[PDB]
Design an enzyme around this catalytic site. Structure first.
Site, mmCIF file in Angstrom:
data_model
loop_
_atom_site.group_PDB
_atom_site.id
_atom_site.type_symbol
_atom_site.label_atom_id
_atom_site.label_comp_id
_atom_site.label_asym_id
_atom_site.label_seq_id
_atom_site.Cartn_x
_atom_site.Cartn_y
_atom_site.Cartn_z
ATOM 1 N N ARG A 8 33.749 39.596 44.256
ATOM 2 C CA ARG A 8 34.637 38.819 43.447
ATOM 3 C C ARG A 8 36.054 39.380 43.547
ATOM 4 O O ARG A 8 36.248 40.596 43.497
ATOM 5 C CB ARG A 8 34.196 38.833 41.987
ATOM 6 C CG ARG A 8 35.232 38.169 41.005
ATOM 7 C CD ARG A 8 34.649 37.844 39.642
ATOM 8 N NE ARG A 8 35.634 37.148 38.826
ATOM 9 C CZ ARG A 8 36.032 37.530 37.615
ATOM 10 N NH1 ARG A 8 35.519 38.589 37.012
ATOM 11 N NH2 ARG A 8 36.967 36.851 37.003
ATOM 12 N N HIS A 9 37.044 38.494 43.629
ATOM 13 C CA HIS A 9 38.462 38.896 43.584
ATOM 14 C C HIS A 9 38.772 39.877 42.437
ATOM 15 O O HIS A 9 38.128 39.862 41.379
ATOM 16 C CB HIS A 9 39.345 37.661 43.454
ATOM 17 C CG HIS A 9 39.146 36.908 42.172
ATOM 18 N ND1 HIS A 9 39.742 37.282 40.989
ATOM 19 C CD2 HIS A 9 38.380 35.826 41.878
ATOM 20 C CE1 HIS A 9 39.374 36.454 40.026
ATOM 21 N NE2 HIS A 9 38.558 35.554 40.542
ATOM 22 N N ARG A 58 44.295 35.221 45.344
ATOM 23 C CA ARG A 58 43.676 36.285 44.595
ATOM 24 C C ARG A 58 42.487 36.837 45.393
ATOM 25 O O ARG A 58 42.194 38.020 45.296
ATOM 26 C CB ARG A 58 43.233 35.782 43.193
ATOM 27 C CG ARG A 58 42.024 34.906 43.204
ATOM 28 C CD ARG A 58 41.714 34.230 41.847
ATOM 29 N NE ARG A 58 42.239 32.895 42.004
ATOM 30 C CZ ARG A 58 41.643 31.772 41.682
ATOM 31 N NH1 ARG A 58 40.478 31.732 41.083
ATOM 32 N NH2 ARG A 58 42.286 30.658 41.921
ATOM 33 N N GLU A 82 36.845 29.068 44.611
ATOM 34 C CA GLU A 82 36.184 28.949 43.303
ATOM 35 C C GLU A 82 35.979 27.448 42.965
ATOM 36 O O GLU A 82 36.685 26.563 43.474
ATOM 37 C CB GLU A 82 36.987 29.654 42.187
ATOM 38 C CG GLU A 82 36.392 29.592 40.767
ATOM 39 C CD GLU A 82 35.028 30.320 40.668
ATOM 40 O OE1 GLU A 82 34.095 29.929 41.402
ATOM 41 O OE2 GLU A 82 34.881 31.250 39.844
ATOM 42 N N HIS A 157 34.892 34.519 44.525
ATOM 43 C CA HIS A 157 35.025 34.239 43.091
ATOM 44 C C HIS A 157 33.641 34.197 42.445
ATOM 45 O O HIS A 157 32.653 33.853 43.108
ATOM 46 C CB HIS A 157 35.673 32.891 42.889
ATOM 47 C CG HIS A 157 36.820 32.655 43.807
ATOM 48 N ND1 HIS A 157 38.132 32.829 43.421
ATOM 49 C CD2 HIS A 157 36.852 32.272 45.105
ATOM 50 C CE1 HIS A 157 38.923 32.558 44.445
ATOM 51 N NE2 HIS A 157 38.174 32.231 45.485
HETATM 52 O O1 VN3 Z 1 38.375 34.596 38.224
HETATM 53 V V1 VN3 Z 1 37.616 34.023 39.459
HETATM 54 O O2 VN3 Z 1 36.190 34.671 39.789
HETATM 55 O O3 VN3 Z 1 38.197 32.949 40.453
#
Ligand code: VN3
Ligand code: VN3
Lengths: 209, 201
Positions: A8-9, A58, A82, A157
């Site tokens: 995940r970012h 991101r 995402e 994401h």
């Molecule tokens: O906040 V996210 O995992 O795009």
């Protein structure tokens, strides 16, 4: 066996403000950048075969630090973005709950439900699962004889990761909400043991820090 | 919602030699005690509400390092014991595979299959799950983010977790084996459980 790692970012400013993003292209926070540095070190040591990222910055910025640590190019794919969150993009949890009490909780328990204008978990799996299938086909080195533990790394994401993971694991849709929430720069690893459908995926790690 | 944390025992000597234990009461190895300390450090900080341990010493001792770390009586429940593995207890992977080729692998893929004399994953879930529901009832406090910690075994954790998630039995093999002194977290929001963490080290 094929090892698949999903990262995940790192933290964004919207994350800090519990503000929904979806496919809004928000920036990593300072903390998020240091998180990505830290994660690249851990995952770098595992010597990735390949890096594929969501094109949202991101994620992409998170992925670039792993690329720098490992000397690999960062490939980019819109199918790793995402969940599009439609009407909810830009609103905070509080704001959403004020308008639609219970809608967030309800959303969470139904993998087929999308916010107005957005995507469901099922929709996201439908776009992301074939990408994994394409990499199985395009990367003979993956789980190959020479270095079979070297993972493919997808940088993305939380929503996408839960959806893609449930789908690879072949959980029935009704069970997809069993998969929770990933931390920033946390990762998940699946293993594919063995036609693409014949691959049997299992969950080795969910949400390591 | 309520946090449920499940910790697999530290390394035993049997683990190093790929030797099946089941409900044989084997000992932590040197490295395993070290692992149990380190895990106690991490998990103590989450301010655990209470601890239940399997009565098997490899698990009990693991739980103790956390109990010491945070000052609670390590409760003990035999319902947290690892899968009884019947004829396989004491045998090595190499040994089982020589007598029953492909049985070990096939076993992993069928939550309903038991070694002769032993238990299936379905059997293990049915005996251990009542402990969680009892703790739901008997423990009012559920500061609602403080976790309840079950210290136990890889088989038991997978089976119990799958059962709490209400995964269909056919999908129970989706959960891969926990590392030594690794932990899992479920959240319970009848109650619907979700997986927050699987096999953190
Ligand atoms: O906040 V996210 O995992 O795009
Ligand atoms: O080998 V253990 O009892 O998880």
């Amino acid at each position: 066996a094929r090892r698949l790692v999903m990262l995940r970012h790192g933290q964004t400013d919207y994350n800090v403000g519990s503000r929904m993003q979806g496919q809004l292209d928000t920036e990593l926070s300072e903390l998020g950048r240091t998180q990505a540095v830290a994660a690249a070190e851990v995952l770098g040591k595992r010597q990735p075969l390949l890096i594929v990222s969501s094109d949202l910055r991101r994620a992409y910025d998170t992925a670039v630090k792993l690329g720098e640590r490992t000397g690999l190019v960062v490939r980019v794919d819109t199918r790793l973005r995402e969940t599009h969150l439609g009407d909810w993009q830009g609103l905070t949890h509080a704001q959403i709950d004020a308008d639609a009490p219970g809608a967030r909780l309800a959303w969470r328990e139904d993998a087929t439900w999308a916010p107005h204008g957005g995507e469901s978990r099922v929709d996201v799996a439908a776009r992301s699962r074939p990408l994994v299938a394409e990499l199985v086909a395009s990367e003979p080195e993956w789980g190959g004889a020479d270095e079979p533990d070297r993972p493919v790394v997808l940088v993305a994401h939380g929503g996408l990761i839960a959806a893609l993971s449930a789908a690879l694991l072949k959980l029935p849709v009704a069970n997809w909400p069993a998969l929770g929430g990933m931390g920033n720069a946390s990762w998940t690893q699946l293993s594919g043991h063995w036609d693409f459908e014949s691959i049997r995926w299992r969950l080795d790690v969910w949400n390591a820090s």
